[PDB]
């Protein structure tokens, strides 16, 4: 992709709902244009879909976690324990990372008690879990993860 | 919002592109129905927008990391850090938690330079900061924020 | 319950021992109505009973601790080791929490050697126990549970 | 006090509300005996008074928290720190004690706003505190202060 | 005993090497009270023994450490562990404690290879030790064990 | 010194109230020799000197601590606070070491008060000193410094 | 070896493509008596060898690990995992360390991918290894290995 | 480069002292190809030059430290720490890295005297110098950074 891409990209980024015009007129190119590269974009696989950003609150999600994992050692343990943790709902952001823990877990629950039942005792039942170390999210300042383009 | 909304809201948090009879006719609703409850929930700021979810692979925003910060006590020290750190370029994440560490900051960069230019050097420099550590993202396991009802 | 039995429930977390009287006429209802409401509380709950404050130093219960205790993570291991922790005599108080420790177990005794026969030894031999750290406490600033309403 | 005492004693730290029969009956021996001992077990401030056991959840206290407090070093500043953390509205416990810690405090507040605005917010100001990390409580299996005599 | 003995003893605990005459003159007590009074002492075990006090670097003990051991917890294991570390050449010093760590051993020896064959892989087969962690003393800003009373 | 004063010195650790005769009988060397040859390790000051073993329970020192200091960094400060730390009362060792504590110091004291007052608030006010951690010694499963031949 | 010898290792510690001459004539010796003391201290294993000092930048070895690995204790363990480690390719540093970790491994390659695939998973599935924290290192301030003599 | 410079280097990495005809037979090209290929690589900075490889052993340097250095946040503290870690004699290695610890720094001396006069004292006088741990190293697995074609 070329300089133009980008200008493109950095919109949408923020605001998926412009018209094809309104871009263009931004931009300075044709509309045809436009629209060929952002449809360029999405064949590439740049750009992997649009989707409506929602209000954590909205859905009274108050209970947000972030939750570090120590992984007992050895055989195919890290992949497995990867996996185990990325399939549990309300968790959205599993990393495998340097440093004294093995994966950084991102969850959010409507409460302590869904936090217990659908997180909490899960993972403290997987097998391949060494350890667990929650920090509970008193305040987000800042998650807006769909800016790429700074 | 009802139980309609909540069907809506999960169609539109993978694929805000359907077309209103694609939805209308899975939920099994008016197309006028439909396109009013979504600008109500708009209106409400249920939904508070729409983006691209682009590929960070594609910008090569390879060096992902995962610091923790932790903050002189005192004065509005943590209001002010919090925000500082929300205002680096390459930080989509920046939240206060109950632990060993005052903050936990999500930062995605191009590179290591990139990263120290940009990151580290400002972050250390910064007076409220008393120490922090950071932990490199050496696999993405999942990154799915925008699934809130799951 | 309403604003009144707030009243009333902030006298009794502090003095239970106070006359009908004394209480109707320092919130200035009807005796009967207060003893109506009293029963109320009790009744629902809300007071689950009277007890005498007894100076723990009156009993020589001059070794205090709070000690975090890890358990082996699997199974229901942690709901056996909650309860085991908590028919142990000498210990009030038992939590599970979130961060690096499971448990945090409040105790008291009259000695080293009691608090090492009748707690340690017996938590030292509890299968699914993986660390103790015992934290002495020197000076009991303040200890007044009974205090809910402030 | 005699092994007399340690039965009435035993039975006034569960139930407060027996009636000077009830216990004279089962301890086996003279109302005015009793009364008398009783009498004599508050002049010598054995018993220091009687509490109504008010549950916690009754008040929606569902923000429950044990925060480690490290103080800074030097001049009179832990006796300070003690007795400013024991003023904090929500604060039950404070604790000195022996560990990478200097103080252990225990508070209840009915929400996360609550205990960021009384709590946690007033503890980052305060100029002898060095460092604060709270555990937050997501299950009391057991919170007995009340029994003394096991 | 009596504020007598404890003079006779805060000399003795410096110089067990002074004769009867020039202490029964310094305490003024006649030299067969004294006489009585020490034999008196070690009867009762209150003195159980007179060594020499040999310096440590005429044996050239140069490589002096301080190992803090974490037991495996379950069964006898740590009454076990304590005694397997009493008996290893080179350990004058072992202590159960509360805190992170289960033992603390002072060893002393030669050079670093005698520590390693004497101490380290000793230590590190024992079955009962779940990990050590050992600090090299550097240097000793004073080991008066001898002095009890000060 | 040779294999001979290894022998004499290897016995003086252990006894040095035993008569010339006997230890001159044992090593199997005239009386005369080996009056010579102790007098000759104490010139050398190979011997320092002579001291009554005194039990720590018999003068009802029960409260033994093993405190790490961490000092603060820059000037002459550690060697300033390992002798500050040295001429505290109740103290016998203060060690400088490698590892993530400064000094480590032995100390004894008859009860908690006394070890409140006569060590913690005197260190906590030491300039110098940035934290202390104190671990309890619940437990002396061996003391015997005074044994350096092994 | 005599202070001669010193002089010419600090040379060839820094160069070793000096000529003879160039050396016979700084150290001012003849050239003879140089050859036959370098080939002296080969003898003698002094010098073990000459390399060539290639840059890693030029090879692209961008990814710098300083890995921290905890063994399991027991048995041969750790004689076992410090060579397993040593065998690792682009492992160039294993140190066995006194400290609250066993192991130091100094590693490069040229990306994260190829740590991933060549050393963390490997490692990850050594039997002997109980847990890993690597630092990675963001920039080399100095790595002169070759300079002994200072 | 190419395939057959990477075959020259991992010769010269080993051995450095081989002739250009060894080499030369053994890659299979003409001495002069060879001869030109070398000069080159030093030109581009590829070989930045020859050392001895001098046994540390020979040099007495028995006590070896792997020191983690954490610095004082703020101003320019990091960049000049990292210098001044450079530049103090027995230091061959400083890298900055990402975790707990900013610095971690490779020295190596002949006795714990000269390492606390050489290298401890001054770093402790180091303004910028917030705390220090040294690991000592009882053995050296492998250190062969020579080696960077693997
Ligand atoms: N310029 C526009 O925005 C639209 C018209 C233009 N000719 C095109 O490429 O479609
Ligand atoms: N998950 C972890 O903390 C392990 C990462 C660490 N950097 C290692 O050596 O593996
Ligand atoms: N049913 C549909 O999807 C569209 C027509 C419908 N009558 C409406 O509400 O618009
Ligand atoms: N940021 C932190 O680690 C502080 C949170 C911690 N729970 C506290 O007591 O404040
Ligand atoms: N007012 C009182 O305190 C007692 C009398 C009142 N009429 C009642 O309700 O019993
Ligand atoms: N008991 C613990 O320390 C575990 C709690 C921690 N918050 C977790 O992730 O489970
Ligand atoms: N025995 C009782 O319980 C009450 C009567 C008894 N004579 C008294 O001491 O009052
Ligand atoms: N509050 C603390 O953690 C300090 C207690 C610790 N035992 C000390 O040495 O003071
Ligand atoms: N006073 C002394 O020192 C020795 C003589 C004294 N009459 C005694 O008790 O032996
Ligand atoms: N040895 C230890 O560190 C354990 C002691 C710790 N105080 C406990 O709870 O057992
Ligand atoms: N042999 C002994 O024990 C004493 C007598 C011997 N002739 C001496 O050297 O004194
Ligand atoms: N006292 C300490 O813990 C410091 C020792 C540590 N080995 C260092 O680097 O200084
Ligand atoms: N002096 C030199 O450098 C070479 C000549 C000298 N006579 C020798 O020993 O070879
Ligand atoms: N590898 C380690 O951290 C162990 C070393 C530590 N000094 C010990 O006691 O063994
Ligand atoms: N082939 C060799 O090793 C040397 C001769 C060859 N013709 C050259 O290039 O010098
Ligand atoms: N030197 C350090 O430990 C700091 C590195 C750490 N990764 C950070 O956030 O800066
Ligand atoms: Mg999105
Ligand atoms: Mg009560
Ligand atoms: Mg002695
Ligand atoms: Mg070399």
Redesign the interface.
Request: net charge positive.
């Given at each position: 992709?070329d300089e133009i891409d980008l200008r493109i990209?950095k919109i949408?980024?923020?605001?998926?709902?412009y018209s094809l015009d309104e871009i263009a007129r931004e931009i300075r190119i044709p509309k045809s244009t436009l629209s060929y590269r952002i449809k360029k974009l999405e064949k590439?696989?740049?750009?992997?879909?649009?989707?409506?950003?929602?209000?954590?609150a909205?859905?009274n999600?108050?209970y947000?976690?972030?939750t570090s994992v120590?992984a007992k050692?050895?055989?195919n343990?890290?992949v497995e324990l990867?996996?185990k943790?990325?399939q549990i709902?309300?968790?959205?952001?599993?990393?495998?990372?340097?440093?004294?823990?093995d994966?950084?877990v991102?969850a959010?629950y409507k409460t302590?008690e869904e936090?217990?039942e659908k997180f909490?005792?899960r993972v403290?039942?997987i097998?391949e879990?060494?350890?667990?170390?929650?920090?509970?999210?008193?305040?987000?300042?800042?998650?807006?993860?769909?800016?790429?383009?700074?």
């Open positions: 992709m990209l949408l980024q923020y605001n998926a709902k590439d696989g740049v750009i992997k879909g649009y989707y409506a950003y929602i209000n954590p909205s859905l999600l108050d947000i976690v972030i120590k050692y050895g055989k343990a890290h990867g996996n943790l990325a709902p309300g968790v959205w952001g599993v990393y495998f990372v340097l440093g004294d823990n994966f950084i991102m959010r302590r936090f217990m909490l005792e403290m039942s097998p879990v060494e350890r667990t170390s929650t920090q509970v999210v008193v305040k987000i300042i800042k998650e807006s993860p769909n800016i790429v383009i700074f």
